[PDB]
Amino acid sequence: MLLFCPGCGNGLIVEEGQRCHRFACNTCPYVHNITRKVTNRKYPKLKEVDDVLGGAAAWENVDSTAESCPKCEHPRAYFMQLQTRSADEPMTTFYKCCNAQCGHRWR
Amino acid sequence: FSIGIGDVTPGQGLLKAKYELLNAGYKKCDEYIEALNTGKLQQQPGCTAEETLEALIL
Ligand SMILES: [Zn+2]
Ligand SMILES: [Zn+2]
């Protein structure tokens, strides 16, 4: 912790004297004998998170279901739509289809 | 073959359905918003609560 000299207000440093450890100024004679226990606790943050991930419900919390893919026609699906390329005047879609775990991903 | 404003004009059935769907959706979202603001929103695996709210709302 920062502690400052009552005289000149520079920063104190800890050093050792002939009877005690002392807080001492570098620029004036002031010293302070450490007579008793003094402490300073930082209290850092623990890495609490355990975090399992990748569950199927965490995958299918998106709108689409019971639609039709051009590959395997299954109802349990995971869709996507894009437009951010205006060279493509047509729309852009991508689909995931996982009822039979077939796993297509096309345009 | 021609396309006209009639072709893209919403029919009565959709006009009713949308009102019901939108109202229901807006209400559900508000509830989820309420939980994050003041309470427990089950945090989805691997995500912060704010992240979770985005997912449920989306
Ligand atoms: Zn000093
Ligand atoms: Zn497929």
Side-chain angles (χ1 to χ4, degrees):
Chain A
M1 190 193 288
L2 295 176
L3 298 168
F4 294 147
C5 177
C8 61
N10 282 316
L12 297 177
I13 64 168
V14 177
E15 69 176 20
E16 58 192 1
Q18 287 71 242
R19 303 185 178 197
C20 290
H21 284 66
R22 305 185 299 193
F23 298 102
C25 190
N26 286 315
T27 61
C28 76
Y30 177 80
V31 294
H32 188 280
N33 294 316
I34 304 182
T35 73
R36 65 178 173 274
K37 42 170 72 183
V38 65
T39 61
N40 163 220
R41 295 193 179 186
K42 189 73 164 190
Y43 274 110
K45 268 194 168 179
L46 298 125
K47 188 213 49 159
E48 196 291 326
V49 280
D50 296 351
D51 165 18
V52 67
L53 200 18
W59 182 257
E60 64 184 1
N61 284 318
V62 179
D63 53 352
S64 294
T65 186
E67 291 93 4
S68 178
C69 67
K71 299 292 183 181
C72 60
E73 297 288 329
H74 287 289
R76 288 194 287 120
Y78 175 82
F79 286 177
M80 188 176 286
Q81 194 272 330
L82 272 301
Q83 196 268 329
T84 61
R85 185 178 184 268
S86 294
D88 287 332
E89 298 174 355
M91 61 92 212
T92 296
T93 50
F94 292 100
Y95 62 91
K96 187 70 176 175
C97 189
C98 292
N99 192 2
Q101 285 73 242
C102 191
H104 294 284
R105 185 69 178 171
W106 294 98
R107 186 181 178 91
Chain B
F1 196 58
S2 169
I3 188 176
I5 193 61
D7 293 315
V8 310
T9 219
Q12 281 319 140
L14 161 50
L15 288 175
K16 307 147 190 174
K18 203 188 177 187
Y19 190 52
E20 294 145 13
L21 283 164
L22 276 187
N23 284 1
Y26 280 166
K27 280 204 43 188
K28 294 194 54 185
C29 296
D30 301 326
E31 308 156 353
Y32 293 147
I33 289 263
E34 184 61 353
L36 167 105
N37 297 341
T38 57
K40 222 292 283 213
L41 190 73
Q42 142 54 354
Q43 126 172 1
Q44 275 203 44
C47 81
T48 133
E50 307 138 333
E51 198 156 331
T52 311
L53 183 66
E54 299 273 26
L56 290 206
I57 284 188
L58 274 190

